[PDB]
Amino acid sequence: PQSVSRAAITAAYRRPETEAVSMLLEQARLPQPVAEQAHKLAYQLADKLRNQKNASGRAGMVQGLLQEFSLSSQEGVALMCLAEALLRIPDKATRDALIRDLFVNAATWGLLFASLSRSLNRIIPLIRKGVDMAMRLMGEQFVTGETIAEALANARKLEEKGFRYSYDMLGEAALTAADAQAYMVSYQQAIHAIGKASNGRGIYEGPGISIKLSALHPRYSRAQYDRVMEELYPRLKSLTLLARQYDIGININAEESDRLEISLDLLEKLCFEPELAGWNGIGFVIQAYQKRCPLVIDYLIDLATRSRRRLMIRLVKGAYWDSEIKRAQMDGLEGYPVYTRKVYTDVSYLACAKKLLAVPNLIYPQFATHNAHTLAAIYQLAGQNYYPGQYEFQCLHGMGEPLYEQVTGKVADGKLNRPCRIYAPVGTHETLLAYLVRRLLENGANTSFVNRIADTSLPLDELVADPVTAVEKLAQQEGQTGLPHPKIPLPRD
Ligand SMILES: Cc1cc2nc3c(=O)[nH]c(=O)nc-3n(C[C@H](O)[C@H](O)[C@H](O)COP(=O)(O)OP(=O)(O)OC[C@H]3O[C@@H](n4cnc5c(N)ncnc54)[C@H](O)[C@@H]3O)c2cc1C
Numbered sequence: 001p002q003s004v005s006r007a008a009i010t011a012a013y014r015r016p017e018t019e020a021v022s023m024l025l026e027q028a029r030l031p032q033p034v035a036e037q038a039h040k041l042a043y044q045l046a047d048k049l050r051n052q053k054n055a056s057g058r059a060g061m062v063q064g065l066l067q068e069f070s071l072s073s074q075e076g077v078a079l080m081c082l083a084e085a086l087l088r089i090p091d092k093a094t095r096d097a098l099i100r101d102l103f104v105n106a107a108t109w110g111l112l113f114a115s116l117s118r119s120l121n122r123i124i125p126l127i128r129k130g131v132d133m134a135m136r137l138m139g140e141q142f143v144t145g146e147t148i149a150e151a152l153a154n155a156r157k158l159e160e161k162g163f164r165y166s167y168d169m170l171g172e173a174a175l176t177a178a179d180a181q182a183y184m185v186s187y188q189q190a191i192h193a194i195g196k197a198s199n200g201r202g203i204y205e206g207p208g209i210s211i212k213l214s215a216l217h218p219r220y221s222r223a224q225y226d227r228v229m230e231e232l233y234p235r236l237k238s239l240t241l242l243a244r245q246y247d248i249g250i251n252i253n254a255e256e257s258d259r260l261e262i263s264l265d266l267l268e269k270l271c272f273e274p275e276l277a278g279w280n281g282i283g284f285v286i287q288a289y290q291k292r293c294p295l296v297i298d299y300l301i302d303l304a305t306r307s308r309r310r311l312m313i314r315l316v317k318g319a320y321w322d323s324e325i326k327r328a329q330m331d332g333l334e335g336y337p338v339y340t341r342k343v344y345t346d347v348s349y350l351a352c353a354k355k356l357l358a359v360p361n362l363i364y365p366q367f368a369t370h371n372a373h374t375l376a377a378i379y380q381l382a383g384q385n386y387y388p389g390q391y392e393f394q395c396l397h398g399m400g401e402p403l404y405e406q407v408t409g410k411v412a413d414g415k416l417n418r419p420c421r422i423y424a425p426v427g428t429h430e431t432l433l434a435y436l437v438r439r440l441l442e443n444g445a446n447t448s449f450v451n452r453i454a455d456t457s458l459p460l461d462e463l464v465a466d467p468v469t470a471v472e473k474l475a476q477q478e479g480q481t482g483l484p485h486p487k488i489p490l491p492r493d
């Protein structure tokens, strides 16, 4: 028999969406004054973000001409090309007298170097080489260094601005015993390096490491409890003891949903190690896109109480959504372990944030998001009288820095003065594929905030719309609250 909290997690695994969403709504709802302040802040953040270098303003002037002289696009370009040429005439008199007398982003790929389709048909082995090269080219912006020494030697610039770091030695899903052993050695090496760089700064101000359980056990995806405890656990314990010796945070990343249960069993055992008594540097990620998330929080609150520590909890939405949907459709079970509409995940995240903020003695919440509304909502939900150890934000390298440039830093310089920990992937091209693919899915999805904010045609108010209000609007149109995505039927259907 499971504990009361562990049993509740199990029962919520694939809860119908109507039910799960309906239950979250009032926990996610911001009180009117808070909601109004969250909106104003969210709008302001998104406005400064979108309109650094005057993007909307420039797009506006371009429309106004392209509207006036009833011109098309390509005409506008042609007109600008001429205008540029006329402006290169050194003397104004001379100038005035002269006057009066599949392949979507092929453009962006161009700055690097129909008619395209045929061109592709020809050369099609070069595909395998194309894929590897496009991976490196696109993945570079997301990587902080090839080695941990390199990544760490780049830390000062933002750390002196009040940013923090969590380093990730890229690579996951070890296939062989040898692979897992190599990941173990890489993590150990990394902890020594990060710990020496940290130099006693501690789990809050100083850098930490993020690890993947799938890297530390071969074929983790189908591994049984007994072997995981016998082989993976002693490794997890050894790394955590080493992190503690250097007093740095060690965070257990969250991966596929069918590994949630075993990861909790590992965390449970870890928190009761005598050598970790009184130390609060253990971190654990929870994914708000799962129906189980609020139930996992109740479990974690009880675990912190029983094991007498403050847990570092990273609340995220989740990185594996596309694969989770595909997996559930293959398994043919009674439902999905994740929500099927993005706005429901948003609602879940806010309800979960409130739960975490209510227990500051038990949990240090780490709010990972690139979404300006989510950030503004958490900022208001955390209440008056911020203190640094209350919570932090987190962001991925290559995605979060512009938004967080408005957040981390001095109030005098126009910032919110809230700390942000940057997640810093470290590795060579051989380790990059899986992480890169997830970033493509995140950045390229039309439901993603980072995709929607780039679209100067989507009004700011829509971009930062309250998710609870959005869910009620759907419910009034559709006939009940929390209906699944119309294009994502149940697996058995
Ligand atoms: C520092 C950091 C660490 C992270 N660590 C982890 C981790 O260990 N494990 C992990 O799984 N994730 C992790 N993530 C989250 C993941 O990588 C994405 O960055 C995150 O989900 C983006 O959320 P958002 O608030 O930035 O963006 P938003 O655009 O607000 O939200 C996007 C998210 O919505 C969800 N979503 C998209 N479509 C749908 C849909 N149709 N139905 C329901 N939900 C949908 C997905 O979770 C998607 O990522 C981490 C993120 C950060 C910043």
Ligand SMILES: O=C(O)[C@@H]1CCCO1
Residues within 6 Å of the ligand: 253, 254, 319, 423, 435, 438, 439
């Ligand atoms: O790997 C990923 O895509 C997420 C983001 C960071 C850790 O888990």
